[PDB]
């Protein structure tokens, strides 16, 4: 179903998702490579322990986008809702407000 995962490539090991995991579940854990300041520490979801409660992902807490949700049909969601894509331009008026 939900089957929330973490992209180890992008995790920064902040742990903002770990605190949301229910205390007994504790599926999310810390994996250390070395030299914490160099980014060795990372986040992993033990899929066996996960109970698809959505607390980790629905929190909107992942800064890197590593925390993803694979929908039952299958689609990776990096966020609960990404902002719409826009074609932007600076509206500078001609005469009155912001000329040129």
């Amino acid at each position: 179903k939900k089957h929330y995962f973490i992209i180890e490539n992008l995790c920064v090991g902040c742990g903002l998702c770990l605190d949301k995991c229910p205390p007994k579940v504790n599926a999310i854990g810390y994996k250390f490579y070395g030299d914490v300041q160099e980014g060795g520490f990372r986040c992993y979801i033990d899929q066996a322990a996960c109970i698809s409660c959505s607390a980790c992902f629905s929190g909107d807490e992942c800064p890197s986008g590593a925390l993803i949700e694979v929908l039952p049909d299958g689609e990776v969601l990096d966020f609960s809702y990404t902002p719409p894509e826009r074609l932007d331009f600076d509206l500078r008026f001609l005469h009155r407000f912001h000329r040129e």
Partner: protein, 101 residues
């Protein structure tokens, strides 16, 4: 104005290669989906143009039903770095949930 459109962490809109099936035997079953998760697209030539231009960023998950290894063009001289075509490059997201407790 570009960082505030879409996810602010991806300068180029990211497209995970979620589903691919060998049964259709054409590999058109490759079904790219953006990180937003609202468009189950396909690897069309326009998507190829976007990928080469750098507008998009196609990615692959490790934990999934296998997309196509050596059946969708693969470079294995180094660690595998799957490519739709040699000029393309599907950077595989690595996902170590099983190897670690």
């Amino acid at each position: 104005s570009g960082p505030w459109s879409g996810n602010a962490v991806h300068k180029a809109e990211k497209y995970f290669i979620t589903s691919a099936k060998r049964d259709r035997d054409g590999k058109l079953q490759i079904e790219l989906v953006p990180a937003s998760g609202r468009r189950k697209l396909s690897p069309t030539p326009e998507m190829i143009r976007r990928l080469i231009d750098g507008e998009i960023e196609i990615y692959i998950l490790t934990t999934q039903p296998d997309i196509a290894i050596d059946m969708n063009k693969e470079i294995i001289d180094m660690e595998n770095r799957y490519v739709i075509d040699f000029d393309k490059r599907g950077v595989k997201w690595t996902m170590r949930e099983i190897p670690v407790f």
